[PDB]
Amino acid sequence: PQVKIYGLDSHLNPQKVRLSEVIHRCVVEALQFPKNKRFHRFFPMKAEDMLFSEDRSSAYTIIEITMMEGRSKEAKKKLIALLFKHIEEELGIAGNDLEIFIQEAPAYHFGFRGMGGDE
Amino acid sequence: PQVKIYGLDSHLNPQKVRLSEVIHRCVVEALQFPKNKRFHRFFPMKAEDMLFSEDRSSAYTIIEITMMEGRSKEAKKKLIALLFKHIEEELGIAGNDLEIFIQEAPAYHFGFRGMGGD
Amino acid sequence: PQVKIYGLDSHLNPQKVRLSEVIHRCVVEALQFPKNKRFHRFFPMKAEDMLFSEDRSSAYTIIEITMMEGRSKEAKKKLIALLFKHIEEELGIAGNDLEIFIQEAPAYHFGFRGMGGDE
């Protein structure tokens, strides 16, 4: 699981370290993924650059998760639900201000540790 | 849909307010999406960081669109053609200098407004 | 193909001209692409913004490749292998510090040069 997090710089920079902890804790609980392998990329953006609907507040945050094919529908749905529940409880970002997107690809589309993902 | 737009800072920064309006106009027109749900992220790059082929002018722009699976092939194809037509017309960006990429995923791959995309 | 390259600023900025060369060489070799058609976007990142596991070093680099569907698995695996080999030889980025991700979509999901990708 590679995670990219996008948000307005003034709201996201003060929450970065905590948001990262909460995200990884959810990933580990929902997907049983090693505690060690936190791979997060944060993109604090200016207001001119990150545009969203009038409906949302300045706390509007996008979380993009990429991972190898093969986890169950149940496990992904649980990841989403955990992230909404703990990010609101722990960081105060309401459900309306939070967007989550999971992307998959076959194992041989990945490379790491010197070899293909299908090995 | 979620839209990300990449281009050279010096070309993209003066055009971004009107590029965003035009992109959304095409999204509304081809996908019957609500006029209110405009979700755009711009990424003006330094010239050292965006490298393209000599076949492209400094206007070269990349538009990446992510949406839930389910739309027809014909609607997605309409969205592409409309974006080419109207960005040419409204902004002067020729078709050779514009690249568009659509990405889909199942609905349960999305979370928004506190519930999954289902 | 479209290529995005992420890495910590202190490592990526000095190396991105050579890394762009080496990447393009491997793409042309594994996919018989033209020697033109190099499309590369670099994202030199702050270490507060690109977090990775403790066993990785500051040379940790992510290469994201977007391409039209239709290439064989053998060609995509060759591309992965060539990138691990030539980037390690040319820039000294060890296999554990290099991560590669290919993403595909139907040809009609693309536009370039004013036409749809399936035209």
In angstroms, what is the resolution? 2.1
CA B83 to the chain's CA centroid: 8
**Residue A40 burial class via C-beta count within 10 angstroms: exposed 0-12, middle 13-18, buried 19 and up:** buried
Main-chain dihedrals φ then ψ at residue A96, nearest 5 degrees: -70, -30
- Residues of C with Cβ-Cβ distance to B87 under 8 angstroms: none
Tokens 């692409």 found at? C33
3-state DSSP assignment of residue A102: strand
The pair phi, psi for residue B110, each rounded to 5°, is -115, 140
B33 in reach of chain A (CB within 8 A): no
Give the C-alpha separation, A102 to B109, whole Å: 5
Structure tokens at B58: 């400094």
Report the CATH fold assignment for B2-116.
Macrophage Migration Inhibitory Factor (3.30.429)
Nearest-Cα distance to chain B for C42, in Å, is 5
Q: Does B84 touch chain C if contact means CB atoms closer than 8 Å? A: yes
User: What DSSP character marks residue A69?
Assistant: S
Contacts of C103 in chain B (CB under 8 A): 103
Q: How many CB pairs under 8 A join A and B?
A: 73
Contact predicate C11/C91, CB 8 Å: no
Please tell me if residue B101 touches chain A, with a CB cutoff of 8 Å.
no
Nearest chain B residue to C115 by CA: give it.
B81
Would the CB atoms of A83 and B2 count as touching at under 8 Å? no
Q: CB-based contacts of B26: which residues, under 8 Å, 6+ apart? A: B79, B82, B83, B86
What CA–CA distance (Å, rounded) separates B51 from A64? 25
Nearest Cα residue to C78 out of C100, C58, C60, C48: C100
Chain position carrying tokens 């290439």: C71
Residues A10 and A21: their CA atoms lie apart, in Å, by 19
Q: Could A100 and B108 be called an inter-chain contact, meaning their C-beta atoms sit closer than 8 Å?
A: no
Task: Kindly determine whether residue A38 and residue C52, on different chains, have CB atoms separated by under 8 Å.
Answer: yes
Distance, CA of C100 to CA of C86 (rounded, Å): 13
How are beta strands C39-45 and B50-51 bridged, if at all?
antiparallel
Tokens describing residue C56? 């990785």
Find which of B42, B45, B65, B101 to mutate to test the A interface (most A CBs within 10 Å of its CB).
B42
Q: Does C57 touch chain A (CB under 8 A)?
A: no
Cα distances (Å, whole numbers) of residue B118 to A72, A73, B10? 15, 12, 41
β-partners of residue A4 are A41, A64
Whether residue B98 and residue C112 make contact (CB cut-off 8 A), yes or no, is yes
| Token pair listed for B38 | 């405009």
* Cross-chain CB nearest to B38 (options A48, A53, A99): A53
Given strand B61-68, what is the order of strands in its sheet? A50-51, B40-45, B2-8, B61-68, B98-105, C110-112, C115-116
The residue count of chain C comes to 119
Yes or no: say if C6 and B10 are a contact pair by the CB < 8 Å rule.
no
Closest CA relative to residue A22, chosen from A41, A38, A2, A36? A38
Residue type, C106: P
For chain B, the structural domain boundaries read 2-116
- From the list C66, C37, C54, C42, the residue with the least C-alpha distance to C97 is C54
CA–CA separation, C26 and C114 (whole Å): 28
Contact residues on chain C for A115, CB-CB shorter than 8 A: 84, 95
Per the CB < 8 Å rule, is B37 touching A53? yes
Compute CA A114 distance to the chain's CA centroid, rounded to the nearest angstrom. 25
Residue B103 in contact with partner chain C when CB distance is under 8 A: yes
DSSP string, chain C: -EEEEEEEHHHHHHHHHHHHHHHHHHHHHHH---SS--EEEEEEE-TTTEE--TTS-TT-EEEEEEEETT--HHHHHHHHHHHHHHHHHHH---GGGEEEEEEEE-GGGEEETTEETT-
What six digits make up the tokens of C83? 């990138």
- Which of C41, C105, C114 lies closest to B102 in CB terms? C105
CB contact B110 to A (< 8 Å): yes
**Calpha distance A57→A53 (Å, rounded):** 9
Pairing of strands B115-116, C2-8: unpaired
- Phi and psi angles of residue B37, each rounded to the nearest 5 degrees, phi first: -95, 70
Q: How far apart are CA C85 and CA A96, in angstroms?
A: 45
Query: Given a contact as 3+ CB pairs under 8 Å, which chains touch A?
Result: B, C
Contact C53 A37 (CB under 8 A): yes
